[PDB]
């Protein structure tokens, strides 16, 4: 084993032990998605109200 990067302070310490060496969408694009879903909800509600009007 090899201990490296030992750092000590009043509240504790840290180190590393080695055992073996190795071998986004824009604001506009998000807004389009939210508005597209809202438009689909509006279309579904309009079809329902049309069905109820018949």
């Amino acid at each position: 084993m090899e201990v490296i990067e030992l750092n000590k302070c009043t509240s504790g310490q840290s180190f590393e032990v080695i055992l073996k060496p190795p071998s986004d969408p824009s604001l506009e694009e998000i807004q389009k998605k939210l508005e597209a879903a809202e438009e689909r909800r509006k279309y579904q509600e309009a079809e329902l109200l049309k069905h109820l009007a018949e």
Partner: protein, 423 residues
């Protein structure tokens, strides 16, 4: 504050609706005058779901009473809790509906429906955040069936984003008033298929058999039948009325219980059903709750498969033992639960038991076996419709035979849709 607006329509709807308000007022500590006299803050934590608070800390049911004749509603106003209802919420005509879906839906009911919607609007306008509506009615008569489904269609038009829930009493020749009940029920079922999110199927055939075979009542009355309905309605609404994690509102219940929009017809069950001081253990509660003899729809669950199940236990008991027994029933009879909906059985526990019982359990099942109920109605419909028998009562109100043919095809489609997911 997720308020529910309650509506009861017709003779059956007002009689079971009044008993429902009598039972849950007692559970929440509300006296016939609207004054709270309980001793637990759990009684009032979710009191606003069903009750408005008036002057003097009075609690007024958010309930609207509808009928096309004043008879039954006069009896309600003279009943035990008759004075608790808001007097302006009594909306009634004088002509009656003559056990005729057409009179309720198209002629007599159309003249009265606007005044009901005015009262519904007044109650909704005072809600902090209305979650939806619950309707109690029968399907075999004229007002509850015909005007009740008319009301549902108009409420959906005005409140399209709110949940619609019904307690719908299905007719049976064993407990029948008129021969046209299959006509009225078939016409109403198609309305429910389209315009409700959740419907508890309360079969008068099942209610009669339970009173006679189990409760040992040789001559059951409607009052005896309505005692089973009150207990069931109290149990299935427990999760809406008391603090809890599961199915705490009408929409989360629908999301848990309805995998396909049209298949939203539930088989309710209750335990215990005693013909009375003996203690009922958790294994006994769980086994009786799943027994077909405790179901309210007169359908054999072993003839179908459970899509979803909600179970509610009431009383002081071991939640560890409740979990073990609920897992036992599922693991014992796993063939009766569809495998393509994992963990489809949900369990709630409420510490407050119903009146007169230390422990109780309520069952809500979305089973494909409910198709037996619709098949039964469809057969009785066709037996008369093939000879156009008794149709003149309906064509005299402006209806055409084609509307009956379409209602017939619509319910046969519903039956075929249940059979699809049973295989």
């Amino acid at each position: 504050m997720r308020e529910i607006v309650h509506i009861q329509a017709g003779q059956c709807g007002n009689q079971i609706g009044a008993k429902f308000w009598e039972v849950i007022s007692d559970e929440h500590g509300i006296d016939p005058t609207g004054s709270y006299h309980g001793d637990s803050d759990l009684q009032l934590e979710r009191i606003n779901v069903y009750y408005n608070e008036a002057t003097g800390n009075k609690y007024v049911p958010r309930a609207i009473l509808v009928d096309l004749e004043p008879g039954t509603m006069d009896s309600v106003r003279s009943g035990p809790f008759g004075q608790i209802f808001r007097p302006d919420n009594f909306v009634f005509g004088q002509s009656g509906a003559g056990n005729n879906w057409a009179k309720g839906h198209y002629t007599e009911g159309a003249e009265l429906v606007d005044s009901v919607l005015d009262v519904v609007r007044k109650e909704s306008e005072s809600c902090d955040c209305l979650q939806g509506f619950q309707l109690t009615h029968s399907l075999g008569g004229g007002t509850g069936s015909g005007m009740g489904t008319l009301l549902i269609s108009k409420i959906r038009e005005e409140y399209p984003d709110r949940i619609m829930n019904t307690f719908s009493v299905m007719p049976s020749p064993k407990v029948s008033d008129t021969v046209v009940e299959p006509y009225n029920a078939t016409l109403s079922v198609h309305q429910l298929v389209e315009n409700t999110d959740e419907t508890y199927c309360i079969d008068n055939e099942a209610l009669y058999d339970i009173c006679f075979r189990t409760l040992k009542l040789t001559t059951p009355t409607y009052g005896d039948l309505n005692h089973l309905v009150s207990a069931t309605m109290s149990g299935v609404t427990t999760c809406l009325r008391f603090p809890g994690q599961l199915n705490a509102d009408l929409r989360k219940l629908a999301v848990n219980m309805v995998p396909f929009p049209r298949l939203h017809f539930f088989m309710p069950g209750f335990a215990p059903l005693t013909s009375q001081y003996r203690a009922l253990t958790v294994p006994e509660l769980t086994q009786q709750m799943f027994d077909s003899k405790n179901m309210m729809a007169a359908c054999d669950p072993r003839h179908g498969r459970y899509l979803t199940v909600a179970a509610i236990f009431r009383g002081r008991m071991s939640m560890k033992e409740v979990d073990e027994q609920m897992l036992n029933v599922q693991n014992k009879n796993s063939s009766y639960f569809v495998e393509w909906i994992p963990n489809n059985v949900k369990t709630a526990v409420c510490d407050i038991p119903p009146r007169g019982l230390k422990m109780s359990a309520t069952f809500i099942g979305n089973s494909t076996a409910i198709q037996e109920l619709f098949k039964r109605i469809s057969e009785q419909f066709t037996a008369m419709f093939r000879r156009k028998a008794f149709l003149h009562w309906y064509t005299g109100e402006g209806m055409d035979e084609m509307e009956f043919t379409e209602a017939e095809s619509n319910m046969n489609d519903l039956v075929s849709e249940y059979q699809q997911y049973q295989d």
